[PDB]
């Protein structure tokens, strides 16, 4: 159905995302259990890590387009990522390595992420009808890899330990690299302009130097989240000032703030919703016992099933509005499950968390899948930078919000933790509902501005 390089890119993306989500699914539990962080420390540290992973995505598109070429930067990103996963596995012998190892993953992700999609765009003549379907299959590739990793990595970490889990993340990257190298002949005439000139060693060294610098800066920021907060605060107010100085951009700004709220909520899946499943949900569904950390896999699960359907099935601001209503309902469902449908021992049915994740995933499919594509329809490089800055800020804010559900390690009674989750999730849902209503009200004016 698709060009031959499509299948190469599909499987490279699948394996890279498997490595990444293998780490993400276990990281907060690893912080708590292996490093002895309180839940509060673990949540803010995950927030900082996630902020760096997402804010640095801006670098790899520039490196691939203008310095080294898309294909070279795919290889380099994959190699830096694999090194990061093996360093994380090594951090169990050498605990002091952990932050450097996470910085290496963040920077590796930054170099890699934009480039396969860019590559995929170049596999099709410019107005090929199959493009939409190919990109929906690309998103499904991401979520198949994520589904496998979030399902299996907690089980593997429980049975064989974290070193094995992280080494298998690294191995997934190695095999992404092997399938790329094996399929290299399929993309010989596919690439950005630097891909076809001999590699500039000057620029390669600049990229390696900057990467190493960034790895150390990332390590420091994750170790000292209290200064990452002000770094992003002052960057945010400053770039806000310079955005205001310089009206389709105003629409881009309001959609950016709405996206920020969405990402604050999305950030709860590996933290507060993860520990809610651990502490206050039954660990049994359809008669099978499961690791509750695996409940995170319900997000890619619902995306994999729902992306074709919704591909089969207003315009921009209303799709954003719908996503915000879905997210609101996910958190109100969580609160309701805890407030009214718990057992006398304080435990709730996992079908409520299945429903929570359905809502949240529909929110993802309406918003983040369809955001910067027509933020690119309203617009440049400055707004991309501000975009990535705001989404990083959203993840830091999300770690902070998650700390309101943090449970001290000595608590053992689910009836003590359930009202904490329900209060926070109910308030998140109410605030998000209010935000969704104000977006609804702004939909017509916004839709005029888009003209």
């Amino acid at each position: 159905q698709q060009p031959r390089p499509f299948f190469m890119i599909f499987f490279v993306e699948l394996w890279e995302r498997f490595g990444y989500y293998g780490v993400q699914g276990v990281l907060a539990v690893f912080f708590v259990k292996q490093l002895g962080f309180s839940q509060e420390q673990a949540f803010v540290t995950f927030g900082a890590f996630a902020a760096l992973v997402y804010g640095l995505i801006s670098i790899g598109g520039y490196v691939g387009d203008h310095l080294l070429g898309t294909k070279r930067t795919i290889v380099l990103g994959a190699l830096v990522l694999a090194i990061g996963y093996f360093m994380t596995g090594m951090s169990l012998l050498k605990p002091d390595l952990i932050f450097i190892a996470l910085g290496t993953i963040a920077v590796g992700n930054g170099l890699f992420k934009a480039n396969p999609a860019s590559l995929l765009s170049k596999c099709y003549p410019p107005k090929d009808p199959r493009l939409d379907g190919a990109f929906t299959l690309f998103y499904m590739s991401i979520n198949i890899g994520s589904l496998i990793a979030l399902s299996l990595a907690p089980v593997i970490a429980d049975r064989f330990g974290y070193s094995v889990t992280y080494n298998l993340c690294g191995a997934g990257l190695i095999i992404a690299l092997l399938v790329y190298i094996a399929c290299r002949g399929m993309v010989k005439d596919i690439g950005s302009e630097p891909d076809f000139r001999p590699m500039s060693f000057s620029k390669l060294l600049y990229v390696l130097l900057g990467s190493v610098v960034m790895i150390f800066v990332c390590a420091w920021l994750m170790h000292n989240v209290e200064v990452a907060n002000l770094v992003l605060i002052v960057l945010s107010i400053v770039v806000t000032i310079i955005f205001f100085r310089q009206n389709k951009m105003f629409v881009a700004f309001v959609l950016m703030l709405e996206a920020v709220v969405f990402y604050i909520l999305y950030a709860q899946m590996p933290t507060s919703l993860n520990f809610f499943a651990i502490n206050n949900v039954h660990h049994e569904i359809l008669g099978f016992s499961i690791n509750p950390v695996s409940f995170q896999a319900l997000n890619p699960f619902w995306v994999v099933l729902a992306s074709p359907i919704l591909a089969g099935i207003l315009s921009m601001p209303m799709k954003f509005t719908l996503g915000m209503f879905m997210c609101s309902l996910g958190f109100l469902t969580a609160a309701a499950a805890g407030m009214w449908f718990a057992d006398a021992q304080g435990l709730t049915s996992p079908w409520f968390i299945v429903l929570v994740y359905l809502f949240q995933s529909l929110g993802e499919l309406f918003i983040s899948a369809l955001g910067l594509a027509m933020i690119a329809a309203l617009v440049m490089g400055f707004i991309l930078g501000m975009w990535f800055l705001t989404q990083a800020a959203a993840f830091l804010l999300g770690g902070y919000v998650a700390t309101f559900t943090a449970v001290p390690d000595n608590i053992t009674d689910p009836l003590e933790t359930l009202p904490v989750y329900t209060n926070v999730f109910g308030k998140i849902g109410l605030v998000t509902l209010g935000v969704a209503v104000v977006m609804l009200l702004m939909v017509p004016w916004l839709k005029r501005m888009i003209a």
Partner: nanobody
Amino acid sequence: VQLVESGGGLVQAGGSLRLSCAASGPTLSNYAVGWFRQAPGKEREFVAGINWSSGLRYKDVVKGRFTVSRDNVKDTVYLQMNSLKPEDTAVYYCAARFGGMLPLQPSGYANWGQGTQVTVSS
């Protein structure tokens, strides 16, 4: 996922016994381990437990007499039972639930030992 209990037996009132729980494939370190007991003609009831990060929970009638503790090198959980009384006679079970919570009812725990008889004679 399968726990092996050891250390039950017969003892006189005022004596002591220690039960131990070990898991096979999964490291017990990630699990809250609760001890339940079933006396003749009644339901399994929560006795005592330790979560994955040293938090403790106890039934009122065993406080000041039973101690739950954990040896994370040997991957084992212990119930040290002192000042035993006839009404402590029961089959004792260890149960394991992933994480930090020790729910009071058997349905909160997925993994179960086979049970060890404890008898306390007057």
